Amino acid sequence: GQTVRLTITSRNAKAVESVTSQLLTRARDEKVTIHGPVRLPTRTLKITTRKTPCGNGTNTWDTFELKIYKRIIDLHAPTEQVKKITSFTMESGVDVSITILD
């Protein structure tokens, strides 16, 4: 039948793994067919700037980084059932998206 895709994104690696595992266990309780989960490539944002205010002294820089984690899960279930699966409290800083594939 129809397939539903869940995407999980966050900047906290520990939070992403916890949410993904809970979705996996809840889905298997309902006896659904699961594809995944898939660990998508991790993206890092970088910004380098000079440390000093004003201009004086040795030109020194510092580099700031920020990583983004992404997972995807595919479900073969009606939309009513997937609402039951995702109906649980989650950690802050994690967003889950629901889409219907064709």
Partner 1 sequence: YALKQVQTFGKKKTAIAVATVTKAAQCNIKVNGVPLQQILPDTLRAKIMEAITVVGSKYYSRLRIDVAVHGGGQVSQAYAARQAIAKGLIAFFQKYHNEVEKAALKDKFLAYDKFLLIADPRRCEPKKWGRHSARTRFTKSYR
Partner RNA sequence: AUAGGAUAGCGCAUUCGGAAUUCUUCUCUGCGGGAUUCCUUUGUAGCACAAGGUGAAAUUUUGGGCAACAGCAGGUCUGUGAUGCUCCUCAAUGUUCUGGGCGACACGCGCACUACAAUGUCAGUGAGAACAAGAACUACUUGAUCAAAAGAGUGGGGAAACCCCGGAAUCACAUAGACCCACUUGGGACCGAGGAUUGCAAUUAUUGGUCGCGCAACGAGGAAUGUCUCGUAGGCGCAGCUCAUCAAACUGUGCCGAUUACGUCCCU
3-state secondary structure of 61: strand
Among 25, 44, 56, 59, binds partner 1 (CB under 8 A): 59
How far is residue 78's CA from residue 70's CA, in Å, rounded to a whole number? Answer: 24
- Judged by beta carbon distances under 5 to 8 A according to partner kind, the member of RNA, partner 1, none in contact with residue 74 is none
How far is residue 101's CA from residue 91's CA, in Å, rounded to a whole number? Answer: 27
25 vs 56, beta carbon nearer partner 1: 56
Q: Which of residues 13-72 bind RNA (CB under 7 A)?
A: 13-14, 17, 39-46, 48, 52-54, 56-57, 59, 61-63, 69
